[PDB]
Amino acid sequence: ENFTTNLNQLARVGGIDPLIGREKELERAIQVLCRRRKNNPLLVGESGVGKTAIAEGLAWRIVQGDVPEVMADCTIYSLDIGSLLAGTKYRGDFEKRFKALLKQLEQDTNSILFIDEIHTIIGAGAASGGQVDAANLIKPLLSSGKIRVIGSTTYQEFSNIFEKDRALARRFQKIDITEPSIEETVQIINGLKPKYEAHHDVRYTAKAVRAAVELAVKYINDRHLPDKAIDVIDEAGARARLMPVSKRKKTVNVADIESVVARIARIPEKSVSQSDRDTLKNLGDRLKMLVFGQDKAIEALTEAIKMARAGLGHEHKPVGSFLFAGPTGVGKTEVTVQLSKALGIELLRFDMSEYMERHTVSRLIGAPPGYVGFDQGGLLTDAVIKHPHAVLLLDEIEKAHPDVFNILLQVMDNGTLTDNNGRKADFRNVVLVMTTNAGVRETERKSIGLIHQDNSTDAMEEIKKIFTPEFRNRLDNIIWFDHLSTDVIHQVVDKFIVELQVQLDQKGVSLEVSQEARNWLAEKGYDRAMGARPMARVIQDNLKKPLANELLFGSLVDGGQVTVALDKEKNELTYGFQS
Amino acid sequence: FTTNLNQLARVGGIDPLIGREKELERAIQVLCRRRKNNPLLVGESGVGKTAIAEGLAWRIVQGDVPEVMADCTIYSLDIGSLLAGTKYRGDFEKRFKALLKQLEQDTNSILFIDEIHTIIGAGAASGGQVDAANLIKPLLSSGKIRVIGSTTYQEFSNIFEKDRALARRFQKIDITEPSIEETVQIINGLKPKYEAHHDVRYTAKAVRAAVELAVKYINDRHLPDKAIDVIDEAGARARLMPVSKRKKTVNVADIESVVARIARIPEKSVSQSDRDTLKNLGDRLKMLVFGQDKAIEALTEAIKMARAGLGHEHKPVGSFLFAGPTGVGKTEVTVQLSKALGIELLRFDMSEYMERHTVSRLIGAPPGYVGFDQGGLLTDAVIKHPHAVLLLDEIEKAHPDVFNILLQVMDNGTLTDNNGRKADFRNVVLVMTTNAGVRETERKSIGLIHQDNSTDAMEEIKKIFTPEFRNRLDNIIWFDHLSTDVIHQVVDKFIVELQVQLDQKGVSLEVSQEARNWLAEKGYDRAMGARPMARVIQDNLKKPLANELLFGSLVDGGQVTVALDKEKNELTYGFQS
Amino acid sequence: GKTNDWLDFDQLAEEKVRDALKPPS
Ligand SMILES: Nc1ncnc2c1ncn2[C@@H]1O[C@H](COP(=O)(O)OP(=O)(O)OP(O)(O)=S)[C@@H](O)[C@H]1O
Ligand SMILES: Nc1ncnc2c1ncn2[C@@H]1O[C@H](COP(=O)(O)OP(=O)(O)OP(O)(O)=S)[C@@H](O)[C@H]1O
Ligand SMILES: Nc1ncnc2c1ncn2[C@@H]1O[C@H](COP(=O)(O)OP(=O)(O)OP(O)(O)=S)[C@@H](O)[C@H]1O
Ligand SMILES: Nc1ncnc2c1ncn2[C@@H]1O[C@H](COP(=O)(O)OP(=O)(O)O)[C@@H](O)[C@H]1O
Ligand SMILES: [Mg+2]
Ligand SMILES: [Mg+2]
Ligand SMILES: [Mg+2]
């Protein structure tokens, strides 16, 4: 019929790419299809695995003859859900269309119906897909068994629509589909390489196809491995084919396709380049150049990360085992975002203080009332699942319930965190870091003695006490941030001034800051316990608050030429106003 | 049935395309692909998705395009004729079929279909089961023809999940707001049509000011579309508004007025004369609210920074949290704030929005239910009133899920409901209040001489409110207890509120200065704040007057005097009638 | 004792639509 396209007819005339691999998965389909009862195969796989290719490829074997005798005359038809629902405008009209196609196929023997995205039509309740209650017109044919149907449902939907419904599950044979191995991915592209080469009229290099798959899966982090490779290869050929007006380069290179991935990934070409060793070698020089202070703390972190990326040790274990421990306001948070920005991995911030209540711990694994909402899953699990290359920043870990510490111990040992929904998350490529603002109270604690001059200077001991000895064994090394120097604080003040100057440029108002003014801001905006945290408020109240009063009315409305000074006797800031 | 965009370019029907060089490179790159050779220009309303498709044809004729695209001609589907012209069955099939043969046999020919979402929901006269989408589906899969589409963000997602086969064939292309420099240039190209229709001339400065004034005040529409509305209306205003003089030229003062009308902001706002209102807002709050001068200064200072421009434009006008003891008027200052500025006050009591299911109503209800048509209360309220005050009283009582919504508002500044209707918070001030600070030690210190062992402030607020949410707040304005001196001023206003009530009954109330002091000290409670003063004024003044008003001399109306007796230390009421 | 948990029940909405007829002549 017009709704469905005959895959066998299409394969006979060409236009269908060949299927490479998937022998073990494809053979399972032939096994269940030949069954007398419960012969409806179900292709449960994640998006991009190539579920449709397995169905299209199966038809190629029938026309070619590489199937049993029973499957010789078999014909596979792909149902177009869009054609049925389109133009109905009446709940039930869609059902009438399905019956006509079903009756036609039921008459002919040895007929199969490849229902793509079957989950859309059989959704339990209101859905954003088919929006049709096709449960009524799906169980009868499945129960009758006259015509067998192939369903390309996703792993998520299968766990809810098929599992909950006994009729669907009892008349469907699950066929697990997994992503192919990296070595298998290149073989798939090599087989399909001539088709794309003949179209673009360009020849791809063997090194490009191999390197493209490695950087595609890591930098894009959007789709699955099979879809990325086919997309980048097609994208690369198109770009080089029309890059110059007259010139052209039939050959391809790794550096050429790297620029293409930058656009779809929205990352600079330098980071997208396969130069992880180069960035790792100069990791300390980059962080020290981007941020100042805590040089000793930063240098120790680079040596440890190099040990994990070398490949030694157990691969299942997590790559990141670092426990930051120092006063806040010294840039402890900034190194976590700068490290991710340089390496290209994403940044995931999970504040432990919010996850303080015992009940809140459960949210990480799953929402308490989320029975209908199984798509979101656990808060921690979903972030890791979507982003397998991202830094995890845990703040105020010292103030957490005891059960929370055990959750971290499990991943540090096995490297895999299970989910109640059943999703499998891997921390092998996820770096884990946590900060603790402990020991600062002990240092700032006023001594009970008469002289009060007693200093502790042993805050590291308190860190080991707040954490159990078991946790200390798992972590290889802990990072310690030393107290900042008054000279370093002056550079932090300039950072806020630069941002203020840029904001004023849009209005044509200048800002001059004296060297003596910076000293007042540094002392006022720096606290021993909070570090540079008050600097944001101190800069705003001292500089921005009065400015707005004059900017709203006064000489500063136009002309700019702002000037700031401080009286030496009273040590108070006075800002001169010029028109 | 169709129109040749390439031929239209030669005649000049389509104005020269300005900018969008990166977008064109992305469209042509994906277009030449072996698979996914159908670009989709997803964008918002008025961004220029159709103009980009039409602009491409201009580049084809001029030859700027790579030679791969040279010799190609773009066509457009006659959406109007196909939807309604071919009402009868058979005609739609035979006429469309002819276009397929014309599309094929010429690889250089590329079709364009504006509003491609329409063909998905096609219409059938007698349910023939044949539509434009199914007819082109085999062709697109084979790749013999290439097409270009256009749709909305909310509509693009609606059809993406519903149909995966069509989504696979099409490649999404993100569109962004053009730069201000790009916007003024296009208006010059479109100037001959608008200026000639109204018989006026637009100044060069007006074009630049129009785009700047629009984005500053008008945030519902998009910059490219905004400029056309303020320009088309500006010329119309000069044609009908100056009926006596009929000014031919357009001045900068003209367009700014049109922006104010379209933006629904008080006149002279574009002139910036409203600075006086913010300049003297402080004094009005001081007289209305006593004992909170320090708190009013922090709130007033923060508001000035937003309007002054010393802040992030995406960030809202303000985000403050009011915490303190009961009766400090932390919610009274929010109410009076709206009256001073004149903007509408949006009150959202959080006691009602306490459950997870109830919090959903803030951003909208799920689809497929009776409450789908209701929409989002918070989104609808802020969209109707862009310049308004959003009051979230007793936020601590609300479920923690509501904080997730507030975290987004303070970060991005925009909130979109389930339906897809975006809401802007740039001109709305966020003023939330909490009663966590009310807790304090009621018992006094143990000892012969008491001590002021007051509990610390903000300690309990750290555990109740998450750190990330706490930091996002611009400033947490604390409210101090009302001292004995401040209570004297509070009583004075309560008598005024009582005097106006008596004015409707013909009774004039005169209270002595000594009487005011007795009422203040009688009910001055630090923990209860200002509420006891109402009960003191109620029990001592309203109760006797009410008895006389119903059964007494005050039935008609008259003067009354209140004075305390030194010997008895009790108020004495005299009625003159 | 641990706190209790309450589960809500959402009701689906579906309605029937009448049909008017137009005679040709
Ligand atoms: N094992 C494989 N052998 C050959 N080609 C493959 C294989 N896996 C994936 N592909 C290719 O990748 C694509 C898989 O088919 P698709 O229709 O894209 O799959 P899909 O699961 O329907 O995708 P969605 O709709 O994005 S979830 C085709 O371009 C295939 O040629
Ligand atoms: N990038 C552009 N280059 C040149 N002209 C443009 C551009 N964007 C918009 N225009 C012009 O601005 C006009 C108004 O924009 P519209 O055509 O309404 O945009 P649109 O995105 O097609 O709108 P819809 O159909 O309502 S989503 C266009 O018709 C063009 O004349
Ligand atoms: N500082 C003040 N100046 C004048 N009137 C005040 C002041 N504080 C409270 N009031 C009055 O006392 C009442 C306060 O009511 P609310 O505004 O609800 O109090 P609030 O302290 O802001 O909040 P609570 O603690 O949740 S009742 C009103 O009648 C106000 O007019
Ligand atoms: N070493 C530093 N160099 C520059 N600025 C710093 C440094 N340490 C702290 N700061 C300032 O203090 C802030 C502390 O980090 P931020 O992300 O604002 O908050 P938090 O520390 O609570 O995560 C920095 O963003 C910056 O404004
Ligand atoms: Mg910091
Ligand atoms: Mg358009
Ligand atoms: Mg209140």
DSSP assignment of B40-108 equals EEE--TTS-HHHHHHHHHHHHHHT-S-TTTTT-EEEEE-HHIIIIIT-STTHHHHHHHHHHHHHTT-TT
CB atoms within 10 A of CB B536: 19
The token pair at A292 is: 């100042």
Inspect the interface and report whether the beta carbons of B466 and A15 lie closer than 8 Å.
no
Q: How far is the CA of A335 from the centre of ligand 5 (A)?
A: 9
CB atoms within 10 A of CB B51: 18
Supply the DSSP string of B326-342, one letter for each residue. Answer: TTS-TTHHHHHHHHHH-
Edge-first strand order for the sheet with A432-436 is A346-351, A390-395, A432-436, A322-325, A477-480
Report how far residue B400's alpha carbon sits from residue B359's, in angstroms, rounded to the nearest whole number. 9
Report how far residue A148's alpha carbon sits from residue A78's, in angstroms, rounded to the nearest whole number. 12
- Give the number of C-alpha atoms closer than 13 A to the C-alpha of residue B35, restricted to the C-beta side: 18
**What residue type is assigned to position A28 of the chain?**
R
The token pair at B46 is: 């008025």
The token pair at B35 is: 């698979």
| Residue listed under structure tokens 């120092």 | A326
Contact B148, B39 (CB under 8 A): yes
Contact A126, B368 (CB under 8 A): yes
**What residue type is assigned to position B10 of the chain?**
R
Q: How far is the CA of A53 from the centre of ligand 1 (A)?
A: 5
**What b/e sequence results for A29-54 when a residue is b if at least 16 CB atoms lie within 10 Å of its CB, and e otherwise?**
bbebbeeeeebbbbbbbeebbbbbbb
Q: Is B294 on the interface with A (CB under 8 A)?
A: no
For residue B111, the SS3 value is: strand
Say if ligand 4 is within 6 A of residue A85 CB.
Answer: no
How was this structure obtained? cryo-EM
Contact A389, A341 (CB under 8 A): no
Measured in degrees and rounded to the nearest 5, phi and psi for residue A576 equal -75, 145
B375: which residues sit within 8 A by CB, 6+ positions away? B364, B365, B417, B419, B421
Report how far residue A122's alpha carbon sits from residue A152's, in angstroms, rounded to the nearest whole number. 12
Say if ligand 4 is within 6 A of residue A298 CB.
Answer: no
**A116 CA closest ligand 1 atom index:** 22
- Percentages of chain B per state (helix, strand, coil), in multiples of 5: 50, 15, 35
**What residue type is assigned to position B42 of the chain?**
V
Helix A206-215 × helix A182-200 angle, to 10°: 120
Residues of chain B contacting C6 with CB distance shorter than 8 Å: none
- CA angle (A23 as vertex; A18, A28 as ends), nearest 5: 120
- Choice from B21, B40, B184, B186 to test ligand 2 binding pocket (greatest atom count within 8 A of CB): B186
Subunits touching B (CB < 8 Å, at least 3 pairs)? Answer: A, C
Edge-first strand order for the sheet with B559-565 is B508-511, B559-565, B570-575
For residue B15, the SS3 value is: coil
| Residue listed under structure tokens 């998450």 | B466
- Choice from B468, B469, B470, B471 to test ligand 4 binding pocket (greatest atom count within 8 A of CB): B471
**What b/e sequence results for A475-509 when a residue is b if at least 16 CB atoms lie within 10 Å of its CB, and e otherwise?**
beebbbbeebeeebbeebbeebbeebbebbeeeeb
Q: How far is B105 from chain C (nearest CA, A)?
A: 43
Report the DSSP pairing between strands A148-151 and A424-426: unpaired
Q: Is C14 on the interface with A (CB under 8 A)?
A: yes
Q: How far is the CA of B529 from the centre of ligand 3 (A)?
A: 8
Burial class (CB in 10 A: 0-12, 13-18, 19+), A339: buried
Report how far residue A252's alpha carbon sits from residue A247's, in angstroms, rounded to the nearest whole number. 14
Report the DSSP pairing between strands B201-202 and B170-174: unpaired
Q: Is A89 on the interface with C (CB under 8 A)?
A: no
- Give the number of C-alpha atoms closer than 13 A to the C-alpha of residue B526, restricted to the C-beta side: 10
Subunits touching C (CB < 8 Å, at least 3 pairs)? Answer: A, B
Q: Is B551 on the interface with C (CB under 8 A)?
A: no
| Residue listed under structure tokens 């420099």 | B181
Q: Is C21 on the interface with A (CB under 8 A)?
A: no
Report the DSSP pairing between strands B422-424 and A75-79: unpaired
Inspect the interface and report whether the beta carbons of C13 and B369 lie closer than 8 Å.
yes
The token pair at A281 is: 């070698």
CB atoms within 10 A of CB A327: 23
**What residue type is assigned to position B539 of the chain?**
D
A296: which residues sit within 8 A by CB, 6+ positions away? A482
For residue B474, the SS3 value is: coil
Q: How far is A547 from chain B (nearest CA, A)?
A: 9
Q: Which residues are near ligand 2 (CB < 6 Å)?
A: B 15, 17-20, 43, 45-52, 55, 186, 190, 224-225, 228
Beta-strand runs (E) in B492-558:
508-511
Supply the DSSP string of B286-306, one letter for each residue. Answer: HHHS-S-HHHHHHHHHHHHHH
For A:363-422, CB contacts with B below 8 A are 369, 395-396
Q: How far is the CA of B179 from the centre of ligand 6 (A)?
A: 19
Q: How far is the CA of B323 from the centre of ligand 7 (A)?
A: 9
CB atoms within 10 A of CB B129: 17
Distant-in-sequence contacts of A371-374, Cβ < 8 A, 24+ apart:
A371/C7, A372/C10, A374/A156, A374/A159, A374/A160, A374/A421
Measured in degrees and rounded to the nearest 5, phi and psi for residue B88 equal -70, 150
> Would you give the distance in Å from CA A219 to the centre of its chain?
10
- CA angle (B430 as vertex; B426, B436 as ends), nearest 5: 160
The token pair at A168 is: 């669907």
Q: DSSP state, B567?
A: T
Inspect the interface and report whether the beta carbons of B131 and A2 lie closer than 8 Å.
no
User: In Å, what is the CA distance from B180 to each residue of A115, A321, B44, B126?
Assistant: 49, 48, 17, 50
Q: Is A90 on the interface with C (CB under 8 A)?
A: yes
Atom 20 of ligand 4, residue of closest alpha carbon: A333
CB atoms within 10 A of CB B473: 17
Ligand whose nearest atom lies closest to the CA of A53 = 1
Q: Is A93 on the interface with B (CB under 8 A)?
A: yes
Q: How far is A552 from chain B (nearest CA, A)?
A: 6
Q: How far is the CA of B54 from the centre of ligand 2 (A)?
A: 9
Find residue B92's DSSP bridge partners: none
Q: DSSP state, A557?
A: G
User: In Å, what is the CA distance from A374 to each residue of A43, A173, B401?
Assistant: 20, 23, 17
Inspect the interface and report whether the beta carbons of A359 and C3 lie closer than 8 Å.
yes
For residue B203, the SS3 value is: coil
Q: Is C8 on the interface with B (CB under 8 A)?
A: yes
Report how far residue B424's alpha carbon sits from residue B412's, in angstroms, rounded to the nearest whole number. 10
Report how far residue A224's alpha carbon sits from residue A211's, in angstroms, rounded to the nearest whole number. 16
Q: How far is the CA of A321 from the centre of ligand 5 (A)?
A: 20
Q: DSSP state, A355?
A: G
Resolution in A: 3.2
Contact B442, B527 (CB under 8 A): yes
B471: which residues sit within 8 A by CB, 6+ positions away? none
Q: How far apart are the first and last CA of chain A?
A: 81
Element (H, E) at A300: helix A295-309
Q: Is C7 on the interface with B (CB under 8 A)?
A: no
Report how far residue A225's alpha carbon sits from residue A236's, in angstroms, rounded to the nearest whole number. 17
Contact A428, A315 (CB under 8 A): yes
Contact A114, A76 (CB under 8 A): yes
Report how far residue B374's alpha carbon sits from residue B361's, in angstroms, rounded to the nearest whole number. 9
| Residue listed under structure tokens 């149907």 | A149
Atom 5 of ligand 4, residue of closest alpha carbon: A492
SS3 for B305-328, per residue? HHHHCCCCCCCCCEEEEEECCCCC
Q: Is C9 on the interface with A (CB under 8 A)?
A: no
Residues of chain C contacting A370 with CB distance shorter than 8 Å: none
Contact B49, B41 (CB under 8 A): yes
Neighbours of ion ligand 5 (CB under 5 A): A 333
Contact B58, B52 (CB under 8 A): no
Q: Which residues are near ligand 3 (CB < 6 Å)?
A: B 289-292, 326-332, 435, 490, 529-531
CB atoms within 10 A of CB A117: 22
**What residue type is assigned to position B408 of the chain?**
Q
Q: Say which of A91, A125, A368 has its CB closest to residue C5.
A: A368
Atom 10 of ligand 4, residue of closest alpha carbon: A331
